[PDB]
Design a protein around this ligand. Structure first.
Ligand SMILES: NC(=O)c1ccc[n+]([C@@H]2O[C@H](COP(=O)([O-])OP(=O)(O)OC[C@H]3O[C@@H](n4cnc5c(N)ncnc54)[C@H](O)[C@@H]3O)[C@@H](O)[C@H]2O)c1
Ligand SMILES: [Mg+2]
Ligand SMILES: [Mg+2]
Ligand SMILES: [Mg+2]
Ligand SMILES: [Mg+2]
Ligand code: NA
Ligand code: NA
Ligand code: NA
Ligand code: NA
Lengths: 494, 494, 494, 494
């Protein structure tokens, strides 16, 4: 059951958050954030730039000083603070879900049941790691006692995208805070509002000032200031592959800060002829269309074995034509608008390219409403590997269906990509499932499902889909600096 | 390639091994060991008893003293010694395989290609663990540094059976020595010879005196003396469920030594109607008949789905009738004799029991040769769950085939046992494989295979099939005593 | 800050708890529990025996059936329920602390600030483990996929003592519930009340019926029924070394259930000449006198280097004479009564023995009040290793001070014990601290502190102080049954 | 215990190694490598450039194809191959130690007893990891089975320096090969020879062609070609902080390959007034002067507490004045030449700067012989933090001694560096040791020792000394690509 929304939630936080206080930008500039369902401005937001980032980094560094409240805090108590934050978000769940829908466009039912549930589960998962990520005692040769300390990496710059604003904030804050780091976060200009409200909850939860600082603003200004900063120890970036390159170059060109990247995808979803047809059709639809198609790991190359191709396509088209596009606050709506004008235009561009290059348009193909950034669910059949829509990340409700004959053929075609974020296989056969899950070059392989995320299981890219992993125990690795301490002892014994 | 065997290998070692030297029993008693293919005495062996065990325990305790060569030795160097021991066993592989066949009865080709290969792999695997089983540094509350040391448990009594004499010795020595323990081993009275030769190789490898001591002799004398010893810290026993109970009671009645047990089985091998028939028949044959049926994990309840039952049984009877029983030094031999007269009689008793209780005798059922202890490969059909031959471990070449209808039914029937050592499922279906491997109450579940052991993967029982695990990283747990050290520090920081 | 206690709290729960309901004993018998500060009966409690244990085990087995709510529950949700339980205990903290004082005798300020705090920290720590105790994927040889599942051991019998009633309950329930086991718990006859109230909170928190069952009653009746039960998979026992032997024998004589034991101690507390004198005197006092001396790990052999002996003894005696013995609800009280008349008499017996065998009585030595079980803080000087008071666990406010000269001497004397639960070293010297922490044969070594427990760091015995470990990640091992699944695959690749 | 060297060892390998074959450079160009003891050319070496790297990367990629001999090889067998390689290096130890001395300049006794020993220990350690770096099975929410595979990262570019040619090769090849990667290694132009002979032994050991490829040549040609290559998945670079920046920028600018960096240092060695003087002096001397000062972790800021400063400096000067500089094949020689003329001149430049900026020249300060690149052991006293010789890595036999008063002062001064590779503390006091080891911002902290490396314990930088760790279990992390497989199952149970 979903509690009724407030379809026009008040905005309470719209400034830069440093040392648990709200600041205007040094410049006093602000930028609009827009409701993509109407095209109207919600409010102005402080436009942070290099000077605001510098204030935030200094606050983070101070909070990280040896002997500070955050450094001296018991690891178990960091876990208590993460659990308190989750409880505050749960108290404010309908507000945050409605604000998420207002600013991003996704259906309120999904913001409520999916995004907010996933945020809670991620924070509560990482609360549990705070006092369990042990270092080692090590049986080195000779008369020595050797051990490692797992220390925090330090001041962590965290740059996140607009597609799942709250969830991406939680994927970053969970592991960083569980391990005792401090954060300077740059939220997406398209969707800054929910993360700023969460900062108020961070203060309410009792995190020391300077442990989390949030600088809304643009990428080449505030984002680049983080990535190039001389006193930021680590940057974690989620966004496009194009900008990932910019981040890695900025790290190398500045202070050799540690880098992890979660980038784009063109994930293959492989339907073998023995798959359960009804389930495969529904999951392939979800795999592509979830979140207005705005998912890094979207199943955007649907490979279907030739003996079931015609039926699969018929059913897929029927399901796409039935998908309800509308006001994301209406309970019947399955698909809201795209996040903004830039994305709307890019997706229409890709649709035009698909038409021009001779893919078979089977449904949709155009705008879905006269106001707001709504696009019809669009399906192309008879897609070929060299087509632009088979290669480039579209990030909208545009499905590609490709036909194949053999399992060996489809492995090669699935893997012939510079992306490698996710993939899936639908089959009833044990051996085909094991053959494909081993052979696919992707960070997550789903078998008979898609978009199954768990705070316990890592996620991230092969190839140019990124480096490092988020979620699970693995998500702690990039937030830890390892120190070996090797001590002379009188006489080592086993 | 298998090198030609010496069919009458010389015996060099037949005494008690303490402090790297050979000793008679205090009583000067010896016992004969018999070649089960001919029924003739091979030689006599020192008959160790309580006073010999007491000498061995004192030697091991002395080798374990703080400051001793074995306690000071670098962990990496324990790994080098295990690797040297494996190289010496490899040098003497053809000799050891023939001596194993002479004393135990198994085909020389199998001693050579299987037993000795698995010994080498077990020792080389554990050599690699010697310097890698780390303790932890722990983020405890307060101004403390807390960590754990993984220390050796100490003097380990290790009692092993006769069915895989060299391999059982290696499964015990590998983890115990990798972790810096010292050992008093009691080898089976039926097959003492190969383990005693390996003691010569332990000295040759360079292990300090007293690190491994071996006492051949009987169970209620030397075995019980180890189990009840006031200065043995840990006992690892492999053998019958009946004697496991005796060991656990001895431990509780003496000094509360730590105990692990690897006991009997009545493991179910489940053939679904979609299995590959030819492979399932061959694997079900192997699963039961391997090693003259003398395997704790033998697939001794073969459950076969009703639609494929008649064909599976026809094929199984044909394969059992074709199985070549004979001199284990002849390369054509698939099945040697049972290990001794006691086991021979017990198996004849169980064959008669199956006949008396109305199981359908489909082939075999009698004595296979004049000399030695050879039994025909025997297959019973239409076996029912309440039959004694369906419940009790037979430990010979006697196959039980049961019919079932549904996957839900077979889970309940397979699990309705007080044993729980292993199980298998043959199916092409991903979901049936996952359903059954989850639901079966067994320490190892094989899927489309049987008797697949790896030094890397743990093995051990549910229920009355044992407690604890051998092999893998898990095999190190029982050989480690954990010490927490918690140190006051001036000011704890993350 | 400590809230004012209800000095005569009401009792709401005094029956057997099975399937989330309250039951009389089948026999309808009850037994009294006494307030040790007054010697008066608080109330009657249902007297559970074998028949009530049988009902509880059947309930636990049913709750453990494959497909049950508790088996199907997400691991993360088990963590949520443990966190809910902790929140309910915190809500009822003032009541539970007063009830603990009423039934056990410990000072209310300690119940509130120490026991209840530690209960909350233990449950919250293990809540975090619920979804983090991973099995392994294992690179076995050959064309196979091999992995382990960490499954619950099953029906766990848990038998606990009276010295820290709520904390001992939490140390058992935390790991068992985090790993998905079900429990039949036998609480101490001397202190049943607080654990029964916590059962009401387990129901309130939402644990499925049958997951936790609690049977108050006596040892040889209800305790033995659990230890010998044919359908209990695992027993975890905390109590005397004498009864540990009984439990281990019961397990071996019944169904080979898995066993862990947390037993007695006679722990050495070593004060080197270079210790900080004031700190060492205060910590040595705490080490022995904490919880009316009723701590398994009490520092009951205080070894003091000869050059500082006279001053340390003078200061220690002054501290003992200043220790306020009285009503445990009075804020000034440092020491309450002993738990019952049996213990009261036994401690007085040991004080008599100490006098008879030639130890120097420095202070105390008798009863401290004419009502309730109060004993004077008692210090014996010039104690020798062979004295009964230097060997046997007294479990009361009776301190032994022994003199030593050298570091080798004290290691050897500390280790000449069949106990090995804990030890401590007070020294400023790095090399002395490392030499002694390595050389001492004890499950926990404290350096410049004592009785520093954390849910993160394991605790348990060497030698006859126990086997297995509680707390930390280690505390999950005995609650896990390991299953290997090994699957044939078309072609294994790295 | 050192075999007499061949002082003019023959060179057998001087070409590019690709697919287990020797190749000239495509250009046919060669470059000289010089014997630094004489300044004379040993031989010419193939001058690899971009086209040679391209051939190497293609060969590595082919060897990494799914289904190849290296991809299908059992993990345990990778370990056997590493052990065989170590055996071959041991067989050729005397030759390799002499060749190392000839090309690098370090004393032969040290090549033989230290470098070659450490190479053997590294490879044998990693051999043991090959089949033990498990992935996880993960208790995700819902009806799923989720697990991770630890797969190889793929084609690994490895760029190494000249200071420990064989050891740096081993630190790279050990973890990369244990985890099943393939390698394109670029050895330092100053010391290519020993790594090329090791390639011959890699072929001899049985590694499949293309698994290890070695391209000698210069940095901006062959090194840059690897760092910028579009089909190299990971680069591991050891060298100067300056070139580390170039590598990270190349990775970002090309294909977003994974990067680890092991860079320079200016490590503080802190001597407290309570240190053992004789030991601290000798260890401080070793800390700085080991390997002609050519060690990334050299203790090049020796901080000495004011009370012991004068004595420490007097003893340090006596030791530096007696250090034997000479022919590295002479057993009396403690210090050989610097590796080449460039380094020789740089070090003399630093000595000049030290004198100019007002450090007190206490001994040495000039050239030590008329031929070869020999420099006198040089000690500067009264060094201050702002002096060039206190900030910049000198990488030669030039010691800086700084005075301090308090432990708080020295933490701040030690940590006021953009380097953070190592540090050490000399003290007898437990609390000072723990205070400093926690507070020092360095990847390794030695206590009462220096330059204690073990294959078991990780090593790497904080700050601009690098990112990632080599050695230990940690050394495997950067060579692993993690894949999550999440499988729908009929009904998940614990
Ligand atoms: N952290 C460690 O474990 C470690 C170990 C040894 C040496 N070092 C450091 O190494 C340095 C000394 O070694 P060096 O003089 O060989 O260092 P360097 O940076 O000059 O060269 C190291 C390697 O990189 C190559 N290289 C040079 N320019 C390159 C370019 N533009 N692109 C790609 N590769 C290039 C070189 O040819 C060589 O193989 C010191 O700073 C020392 O501290 C660090
Ligand atoms: Mg953008
Ligand atoms: Mg027997
Ligand atoms: Mg009692
Ligand atoms: Mg250079
Ligand atoms: Na918006
Ligand atoms: Na025999
Ligand atoms: Na009571
Ligand atoms: Na050279």
């Amino acid at each position: 059951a979903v509690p009724a929304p407030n379809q026009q939630p008040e905005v309470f936080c719209n400034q830069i958050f440093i040392n648990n206080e709200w600041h205007d930008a040094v410049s006093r500039k602000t930028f609009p954030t827009v409701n993509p369902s109407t095209g109207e401005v919600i409010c102005q937001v402080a436009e942070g730039d290099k000077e605001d980032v510098d204030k935030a980094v200094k606050a983070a560094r101070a909070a990280f000083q040896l002997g500070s409240p955050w450094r001296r805090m018991d690891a178990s108590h960091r876990g208590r603070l993460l659990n308190r934050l989750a409880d505050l978000i749960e108290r404010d769940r309908t507000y945050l879900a409605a604000l998420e829908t207002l600013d991003n466009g996704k259906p309120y039912v999904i913001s409520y049941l999916v995004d907010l549930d996933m945020v809670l589960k991620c924070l509560r998962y990482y609360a549990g790691w705070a006092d369990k990520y042990h270092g080692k005692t090590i049986p080195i040769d000779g008369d020595f006692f050797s051990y490692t300390r797992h220390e925090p990496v330090g001041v962590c710059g965290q740059i996140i995208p607009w597609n799942f604003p709250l969830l991406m904030q939680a994927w970053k804050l969970g592991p960083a805070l569980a391990t005792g780091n401090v954060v300077v976060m740059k939220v997406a200009e398209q969707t800054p509002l929910t993360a700023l409200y969460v900062a108020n909850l961070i203060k309410e939860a009792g995190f020391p000032p300077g442990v989390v600082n949030i600088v809304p603003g643009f990428g080449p200004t505030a984002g680049a200031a983080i990535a190039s900063h001389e006193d930021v120890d680590k940057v974690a970036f989620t966004g496009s592959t194009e900008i990932g390159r910019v981040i890695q170059v900025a790290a190398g060109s500045s202070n050799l800060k540690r880098v992890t990247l979660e980038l784009g995808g063109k994930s293959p979803n492989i339907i073998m002829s023995d798959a359960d047809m009804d389930w495969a059709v529904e999951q392939a639809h979800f795999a592509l269309f979830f979140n207005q198609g705005q998912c890094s790991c979207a199943g955007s190359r649907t490979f279907v074995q030739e003996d079931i191709y015609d039926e699969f396509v018929e059913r897929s088209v029927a399901r796409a034509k039935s998908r309800v596009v509308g006001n994301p606050f209406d309970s019947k709506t399955e698909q809201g608008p795209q996040v903004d004008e830039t994305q709307f235009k890019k997706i229409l561009g890709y649709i035009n390219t698909g038409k021009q290059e001779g893919a078979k348009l089977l449904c949709g193909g155009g705008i879905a409403a006269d106001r707001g950034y709504f696009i019809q669910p669009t399906v192309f059949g008879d897609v070929q590997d060299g087509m632009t829509i088979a290669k480039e990340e579209i990030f909208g409700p545009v499905m590609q269906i490709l036909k194949f004959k053999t399992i060996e053929e489809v492995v090669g075609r699935a893997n012939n990509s510079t992306y490698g974020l996710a993939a899936a296989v639908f089959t009833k056969d044990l051996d085909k499932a094991n053959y494909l899950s081993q052979a696919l070059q992707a960070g997550t392989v789903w078998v008979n499902c898609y978009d199954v995320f768990g705070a316990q299981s890592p996620f991230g890219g092969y190839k140019m889909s990124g480096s490092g992993r988020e979620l699970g125990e693995y998500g702690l690795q990039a937030y830890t600096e390892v120190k070996t301490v090797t001590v002379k002892v009188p006489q080592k014994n086993s």
